[PDB]
UniProtKB/Swiss-Prot annotation:
It comes from Homo sapiens (Human). This is Heat shock protein HSP 90-alpha. Molecular chaperone that promotes the maturation, structural maintenance and proper regulation of specific target proteins involved for instance in cell cycle control and signal transduction. Undergoes a functional cycle that is linked to its ATPase activity which is essential for its chaperone activity. This cycle probably induces conformational changes in the client proteins, thereby causing their activation. Interacts dynamically with various co-chaperones that modulate its substrate recognition, ATPase cycle and chaperone function. (Microbial infection) Seems to interfere with N.meningitidis NadA-mediated invasion of human cells. Decreasing HSP90 levels increases adhesion and entry of E.coli expressing NadA into human Chang cells; increasing its levels leads to decreased adhesion and invasion. The lineage of its organism: Eukaryota, Metazoa, Chordata, Craniata, Vertebrata. The TPR repeat-binding motif mediates interaction with TPR repeat-containing proteins like the co-chaperone STUB1. Disulfide bonds: none annotated.
Length: 237
């Protein structure tokens, strides 16, 4: 059953790229969260780690079809890699975070109606605390992220590199990086107001208590940017 596999790739680029602007109804959701004056809600760690757990449960489901073990040979897990020099936090997923059809469909961002009829239920019923559990608000990551960059490649399928955050537009274009077989690279840039929220010990202790509920392999690893040098310089371009 070959669902994918449709030619190597067409050498037709420069299609004016894909640029999407936050729609009026989306401007409401985006405003309602940022106009909170930023109360800091690190609870999102548990919300997001739940979805990534689903992504591993998804590949785990695919392992029922796989007669080798799980994916290929060794293993599959959630890896957290903080880069203090770049001020970036890179989470690499080796499962199935998202699919290409859902990617273009604007995962849980496609309101069309009027934001959501749940806005009314928000007046007397639910709160913003269920932001991610509704499966229609994973873009709320901008709450604590200045820049949200996602690069992903799927096995046999093409490569995708798209930008996200808040403030203007959303962009998606064909990728040609070719860094892995099939992984989701979630790297978001910390704001200068979060320079102290980069303590490894903080992360260690926080995930220690929350991961007690999640029964899946997680790894806090850090690769020291060596050999080369990554810093702020002005010479490129």
């Amino acid at each position: 059953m070959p669902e994918e596999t449709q030619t190597q790739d067409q050498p037709m680029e420069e299609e004016e790229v894909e640029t999407f602007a936050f729609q009026a109804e989306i401007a409401q959701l985006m405003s309602l969260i940022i106009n909170e004056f930023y109360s800091n809600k690190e609870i999102f760690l548990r919300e997001l780690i739940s979805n990534s757990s689903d992504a591993l449960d998804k590949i785990r489901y695919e392992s029922l079809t796989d007669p080798s073990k799980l994916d290929s040979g060794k293993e599959l897990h959630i890896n957290l890699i903080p880069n203090k020099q770049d001020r970036t936090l890179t989470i690499v997923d080796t499962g199935i975070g998202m699919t290409k059809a859902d990617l273009i469909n604007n995962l849980g961002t496609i309101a069309k109606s009027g934001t959501k009829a749940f806005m009314e239920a928000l007046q007397a019923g639910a709160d913003i605390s269920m932001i991610g559990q509704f499966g229609v608000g994973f873009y709320s990551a901008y709450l604590v992220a200045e820049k949200v960059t996602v690069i992903t490649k799927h096995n046999d399928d093409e490569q995708y590199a798209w930008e996200s955050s808040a403030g203007g537009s959303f962009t998606v274009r064909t990728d040609t990086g070719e860094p892995m077989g099939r992984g989701t690279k979630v790297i978001l840039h910390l704001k200068e107001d979060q320079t102290e929220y980069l303590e490894e010990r903080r992360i260690k202790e926080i995930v220690k208590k929350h991961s007690q509920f999640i029964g899946y392999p997680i790894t806090l690893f850090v690769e020291k940017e060596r050999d080369k040098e990554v810093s702020d310089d002005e010479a490129e371009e």
